[PDB]
Amino acid sequence: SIGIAVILVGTSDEVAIKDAHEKDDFHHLSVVPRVELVAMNETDPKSIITRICDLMSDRKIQGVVFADDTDQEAIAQILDFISAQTLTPILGIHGGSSMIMADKDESSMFFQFGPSIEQQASVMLNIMEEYDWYIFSIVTTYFPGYQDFVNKIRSTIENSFVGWELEEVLLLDMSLDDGDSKIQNQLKKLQSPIILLYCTKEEATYIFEVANSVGLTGYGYTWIVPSLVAGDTDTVPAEFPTGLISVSYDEWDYGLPARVRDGIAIITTAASDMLSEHSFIPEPKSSCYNTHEKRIYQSNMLNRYLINVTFEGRNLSFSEDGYQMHPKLVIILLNKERKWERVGKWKDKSLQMKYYVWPRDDHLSIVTLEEAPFVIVESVDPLSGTCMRNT
Amino acid sequence: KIVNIGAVLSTRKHEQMFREAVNQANKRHGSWKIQLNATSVTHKPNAIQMALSVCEDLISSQVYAILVSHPPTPNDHFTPTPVSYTAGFYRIPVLGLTTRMSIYSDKSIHLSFLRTVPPYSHQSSVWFEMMRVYSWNHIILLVS
Amino acid sequence: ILGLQLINGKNESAHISDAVGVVAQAVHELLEKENITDPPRGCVGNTNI
């Protein structure tokens, strides 16, 4: 049969989670869900290499659900080697396993929680139209995954009937020391009211320092950040200005027991399709010794039969990059104090803003009227979302 | 104090001179409290043998520099991939020896890397110096 | 068929001899600033960077 053992690391209550494991109505197929509960600390890599391979060899274990609650920068790739080594399905739920990975090996199958890199380019583009945020700029540096992201955003600009405002692209070096004199001068070249940034909070602490040094965040400047910049709502270094707006994976609306139960469901329902037609299951060696020479029974069928996986009627297809590509995104804005508060939600590829005008002289108001040869009013064109250029 | 330098090589018979090779340079460096000492581990052509001999021996030796060799098989690239994997999170400095592949050259992962031998990817730049002098204005391309 | 080769790319004895030599003087240059702390002993105890 099949068996899945959960790997819970951090502070939580596994008593309530363990109850829901043995509650599935799986009478359709003889899945025989073997449930094992593991909860300990494995921060150091020494314990990981001495305990993980022993768990999979218990009784033909072919499923692992693993999660954390911290923001370590090296949690995710510690299991990438195991995924590269053995074809055991390992999924990252929370903690440091909620990151976006640039390049993965063909034998290093892995599933990560979080929207894809290019999907972050399809969320802020839909919201910048609603609030007249038609002017933007990009600042970043040498990072693992910036080359592909910048290609997608400029690709959507050309194939449109409405022009877009771009004010340069900044790629200031950060590895070189004594770069203070080489960043302030370049930061002066930025004049767009809305500026997009792509950094990491661990290394961006200097980015806000120089940005707030020149003080180009007075009244008409608003910062949008991706999911990975914030990291955690509680973790606030008291450096962001008042009114930071962000978009990140939902955690308030997606609880702990819902996501962990989806991981075991996805793996179990993947084997049902395999037995539906072929009526067979590969049986590789269940040992962490000489795994390289014992990988004759390739698991290519499971990799190619995962796209047609659904749970509770909602599609959760995973591509070769191991992403669902349709997660729940939350439009969350920092309050007056250092508190992160949700404002909007992302669902059905649509945006539902609670407000209509961004919170607060160069911003005046006008009132007009319909006249025959002077002021003409026309409806919005639905094909392009917005109405038309030059109006 | 005693200073240890990491190394990843096989054929301990060949590694015997490496203990003497560092010993020759031991009296060369002008450091007064740093004394380099050979600290090399057998290169096992399998990841299982190294799955229990990393934290116990390599990191525990307080090694500051790591050297990675090549497997006896001329066509192989699975030997230097775990050494830079375990020395990246701890950010232990490394220095490659038989660097022929371009996996550790994109700077996305394992930024701390040194190549004492250029990989296969570097042969294209030096290729200009022959085509331009030897006519051949129009050229076709074939690649795997 | 026209072949090619790069010199001093296969002498493993010469590479290691130069590898220790370049870092021997780099050690001298290293011990010239502050915040120079030895790496923590072992790996189980070490959890930070």
Secondary structure of chain A as H, E, C letters = CEEEEEEECCCCCHHHHHHHHCCCCCCCCCCCEEEEEEECCCCCHHHHHHHHHHHHCCCCCCCEEEECCCCCCCCHHHCHHHHHHCCCCEEECCHHHCCCCCCCCCCCCCEECCCCCHHHHCCHHHHHHHCCCCEEEEECCCCCCHHHHHHHHHHHHHCCCCCCEEEEEECCCCCCCCCHHHCHHHHHCCCCCEEEECCCHHHHHHHHHHHHHHCCCCCCCEEEECHHHHCCCCCCCCCCCCCCEEEEECCCCCCHHHHHHHHHHHHHHHHHHHHHHCCCCCCCCCCCCCCCCCCCCCCHHHHHCCCCCEECCEECCCCCCCCCCCCCEEEEEECCCCCEEEEEEEECCEEECCCCCCCCCCCCCCCCCCCCCCCCCCCCCCCCCCCCCCC
- For residue B117, list chain C residues with Cβ-Cβ distance below 8 A: 9, 15
Q: Which residues contact A73 (CB under 8 A, 6 or more apart)?
A: A96, A202
> What span, in angstroms and rounded, lies between the C-alpha atoms of A304 and A308?
9
Is A94 annotated as a binding-site member?
yes
Q: Which is it for strands A165-170 and A135-139: parallel, antiparallel or unpaired?
A: parallel
- For residue C21, list chain B residues with Cβ-Cβ distance below 8 A: 25, 28
Interface chains of chain B (3 or more CB pairs under 8 Å):
A, C
> What span, in angstroms and rounded, lies between the C-alpha atoms of A205 and A187?
16
Sign of CA dihedral B62, B65, B71, B72: negative
> What span, in angstroms and rounded, lies between the C-alpha atoms of B45 and B71?
7
Q: Is C28 on the interface with B (CB under 8 A)?
A: yes
* A43 Cα to chain C: minimum distance (Å): 7
What experiment produced this structure?
Answer: cryo-EM
> What span, in angstroms and rounded, lies between the C-alpha atoms of B106 and A144?
9
For residue A239, how many other CB atoms are within 10 A of its CB? 14
> What span, in angstroms and rounded, lies between the C-alpha atoms of A325 and A173?
31
> What span, in angstroms and rounded, lies between the C-alpha atoms of A119 and A249?
12
Q: What DSSP state is assigned to residue B3? A: E
Q: Which residues contact C47 (CB under 8 A, 6 or more apart)?
A: A43, A44
> What span, in angstroms and rounded, lies between the C-alpha atoms of A300 and B10?
34
| CA neighbor of B11 nearest in space, from B91, B71, B89, B95 | B71
* B68 Cα to chain C: minimum distance (Å): 10
One-letter amino acid identity for A231? G
Task: Please provide residue A95's backbone torsions phi and psi, each rounded to the nearest 5 degrees.
Answer: 65, -140
Residue B4 three-state SS? strand
Q: Which of B46, B52, B89 sits opposite A292 (nearest CB)?
A: B46
A45:C46 CB<8 A: no
* Residue written as token pair 């109505």: A25
Q: Which residues contact B76 (CB under 8 A, 6 or more apart)?
A: B70
Contact B119, B100 (CB under 8 A): yes
B55: exposed, middle or buried (C-beta count within 10 Å: 0-12, 13-18, 19+)? buried
B89:A53 CB<8 A: no
Tell me the β-bridge partners of B42. Answer: B9
> What span, in angstroms and rounded, lies between the C-alpha atoms of A116 and A145?
11
Tell me the β-bridge partners of A33. Answer: A2
- For residue A45, list chain C residues with Cβ-Cβ distance below 8 A: 43
- Please, what is the angle between helix A256-277 and helix A14-21, to 10°? 30
From edge to edge, which strands make up the β-sheet containing A33-39? Answer: A33-39, A2-8, A64-67, A90-92, A111-112
CA B112: distance to chain centroid? 11
> What span, in angstroms and rounded, lies between the C-alpha atoms of A300 and B125?
39
* Composition of chain B by helix, strand, coil, percent to 5: 30, 15, 55
Q: Encoding tokens for residue A206? A: 């200097």
Q: Which residues contact B20 (CB under 8 A, 6 or more apart)?
A: none
Contact A1, A272 (CB under 8 A): no
Contact A2, A268 (CB under 8 A): yes
